[PDB]
Amino acid sequence: EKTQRYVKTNAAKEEYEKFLSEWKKQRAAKAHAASAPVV
Amino acid sequence: GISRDSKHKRRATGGRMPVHRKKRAFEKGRPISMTKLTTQSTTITEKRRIRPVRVRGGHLKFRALRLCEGNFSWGSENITRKTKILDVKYNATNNELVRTKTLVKNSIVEIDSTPFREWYKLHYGIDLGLKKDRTVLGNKEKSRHVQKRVKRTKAQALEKNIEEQFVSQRILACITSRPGQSGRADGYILEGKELEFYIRKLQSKKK
Amino acid sequence: MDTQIQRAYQKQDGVFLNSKKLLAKKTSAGVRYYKNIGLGFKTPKEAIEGTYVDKKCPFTSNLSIRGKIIKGLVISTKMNRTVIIRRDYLHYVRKYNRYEKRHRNIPVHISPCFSVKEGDILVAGQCRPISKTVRFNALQVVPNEIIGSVRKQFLLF
Amino acid sequence: ARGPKKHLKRINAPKSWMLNKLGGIWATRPSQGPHKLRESLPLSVLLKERLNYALNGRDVTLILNDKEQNVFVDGKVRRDKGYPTGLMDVVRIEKTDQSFRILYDTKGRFVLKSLSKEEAKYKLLKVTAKAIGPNQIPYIVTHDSRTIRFPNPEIKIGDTLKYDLVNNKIENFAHLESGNVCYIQQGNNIGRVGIIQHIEKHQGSFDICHVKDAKGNAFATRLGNIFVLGQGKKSWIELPSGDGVRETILEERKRKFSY
RNA sequence: GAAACUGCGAAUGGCUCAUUAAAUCAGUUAUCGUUUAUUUGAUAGUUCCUUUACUACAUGGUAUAACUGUGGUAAUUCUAGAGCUAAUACAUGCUUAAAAUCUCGACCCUUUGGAAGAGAGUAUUUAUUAGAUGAUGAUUCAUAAUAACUUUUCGAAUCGCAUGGCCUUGUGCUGGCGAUGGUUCAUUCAAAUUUCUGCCCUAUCAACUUUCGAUGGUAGGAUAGUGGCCUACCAUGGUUUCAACGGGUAACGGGAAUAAGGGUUCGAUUCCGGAGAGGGAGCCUGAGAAACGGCUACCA
Secondary structure, eight states, X not given: OHHHHHHHHXXXXXXXXXXXXXXXXXXXXXXXXXXXXXX | OOOOOGGGSEETTXXXXXXXXXXXXXXXXXXXXXXXXXXXXXXXXXXXXXXXEEOSSSOEEEEEEEESEEEEEETTTTEEEEEEEEEEOOOSSOSHHHHTTOOOTTOEEEEESHHHHHHHHHHHSBOOSSGGGOXXXXXXXXXXXXXXXXXXXXXXXXOHHXXXXXXXXXXXXXXXXXXXXXXXXXXXXXXXXXXXXXXXXXXXXXX | OTTTTXXXXXXXXXXXXXXXXXXXXXXXXXXXXXXXXXXXXXXXXXXXXXXXXXXXXXXXXXXXXXXXXXXXXXXXXXXXXXXXXXXXXXXXETTTTEEEEEEEEEEEEOOTTSOOOTTOEEEEEEOOOOSSSOXXXXXXXXXXXXXXXXXXXXXXX | OOSOOOOOBGGGSOGGGTOOSSSOSBOOOOOSSSSOSSSOEEHHHIIIIIIOSOOSHHHHHHHTTSTTOOEEXXXXXXXXXXXXXXXXXXXXXXXXXXXXXXXEOSSSOEEEEEOOTTGGGEEEEEEEEEXXXXXXXXXXXXXXXXXXXXXXXXXXXXXXXXXXXXXXXXXXXXXXXXXXXXXXXXXXXXXXXXEEOOOOOOOSSOOEEXXXXXXXXOEEEEGGGEEEEESTTOOSSOOSSSSSOOOOHHHHHHHXXXX
């Protein structure tokens, strides 16, 4: 259980991180989608 | 039961103020703890003494009664080593604390330059021992010794006051820690604004 | 040499920069503690470029302001950076169905920044206990003119 | 005072418990838990006076002490005479697989809503605080005193989450902003459910909020009392006493005895 | 099951204004100013790296009762001396099986990711740096670090059933699950302050308050921690006819809702809410007492 602690944490950590790159990728992805039609 | 309830006072309009409550235990007031120094074991063998007091929450609070060594930091350089404090001078609060070399949070004292001297040497190639032999570098100037230069050239214009201090072996510094509260005694090394000033208090104090 | 020593035995800041600043020998070294209590309050110009070391200030210290905010006329200028503001209100009288006049006196702390004067309206904030009486700090000062007796002066301000 | 109180008086125990005035003299005092004293329903109350499964006091003592486990709160077993079941909770009666919502009336009395094995899965959580803690990590906290690790970042402090108890998973949240549905956890207006109109913050230390609903009534309460029962008109849970809307004493009469 | 050990509450109340004209108390303060059992929630890889006979954890040492007994004495909650044994209590304590384990990542090698070779815990201190890249109005805020340097921590020698699955075949596990912990945070627990309205009369109260506090402001120190609270150190303060200084009222002390109109009524002899448990003193518990109903010792 001591061991399973840092395991579950790495899983959630990399999990979050993996999500962030996908969200942020989209956050900036909509940035040219919104500023494009204004052009 | 040395209390501190604000009841035994006189409201704004100085009229005495009533009481119906016996002194209640949460108004605790612990016996003061003057803090001396062992930079003179002429009698005092046991160098430093710290007694822990059982505080409210259930925690312990260490109380400094007698000491001899604290920790200090050189503002400028960001260095901090544990050193032996020397004699207390000018306590501001009162001169008696100096007369009994007592340790107040903000008591200005002296320390051993040794750790700082030792360091300033290793990182800059400058011992600070009597001026002439000033530097002490390497024989060959091709490798990493090229850095002690780069740093040394950082116009390490350490105030004319900081310099004199080192050589004399003594160093000026003020404290920043309640001995009667945490048991320790930590201080910063004196410089610019306050240095110049506190010294003045000392020059004129004796003269 | 003046603002620093002036009797008292030292006057630094909360952000202990100073002497170390001599390390950043190029940009701006003369730092002072800067803040902004917010709550719809402008931070005094004088407060920033001052040499004053008032720990009990709401812009030069870790002194907060919370809840109760006051507006009242000033009574006395004496005391070191502390002033007494007098508030003038009416009290109702159940029976006679009318009012009477009344005045509460208040201990207010004044950061050097704003300049006092006797008989002017002042705005205090709710700051932690600073002393027996004090429990209010000045945050906004309005100069006002009353030709004489401050006591006579009674305004439902 | 001597130390810390430890009992509770019949007379002094909340009107939300619809308690027996003549009853006794005391009343099971809520145990320090997930919900505050006033905002809670200790189990003993929940079974004896509420469900009525229990009866006499010892009746409970059996139920929660019996080696069978008959009571579940948010997918967990409980054996405390006065566990403070709070707002938006899910209680299951093992031996019958009963699932309930801990929700206030429209008249402010604690009501027990019967759920289908379906809703019994999700529970609505309101966001307490939100800040980053140890080793660069984000934490969110719910009224239900839930502490959350690595939560979706698009969540502001005054949010409302849908919780999948089965997987201890989050899904579809929704902050409080002009145009949502809400439940008021406490106040001269509790038990109501309407559309948020606008939130005027006054910072001086107390922001307020307005609301509309079915008969388009105007509601006013402090933010701390707003719980987002849903995003954009669609509520997220079945409400007790029909829709979260109370009637004039006049409307009650006309609806019941039709005057 | 005897008994003991435990380990718990035994700071709870309950009667008591006796005081008390005082914020008492009411509202009316968050507390950037203070403490926090209770309750959860959470939860904790960096402890060596000795220059792994780490011994080797086929989880240490003690210590003790209780206990059998030997007793004493006008006589104790008496107690003596004899022996015992526990232990969820003292007192600990390498965490290996090598190169521990942390932390880059080439790279492919595609996943099993392979990942090279990339690099390496905390109570207690300051001291800087964060903080551009959480938050406040708000921060010197955090929670960061950061070194140092701290007679300083931290860290389940738990027990409970659940031991049948895994491979091994003894094995290695398998620990399941809880009980039994610790950790810090907020988690209610709190208190604890705290603004902001309000006791009887009185101007025949005019004036008041300053030796250390009357004030400010400051050094410290206490305070657990805010505070003149004090050490100082000084500021002269300022209060005040809206009567302030002040005086005088034994003063312990004061929540529900209906309601054209009316009908009626409530909480229940005070919701509220400070100060006594011979005198005095000091001390006591502790999360947590101005500990009444703990002491002592003193007096009686």
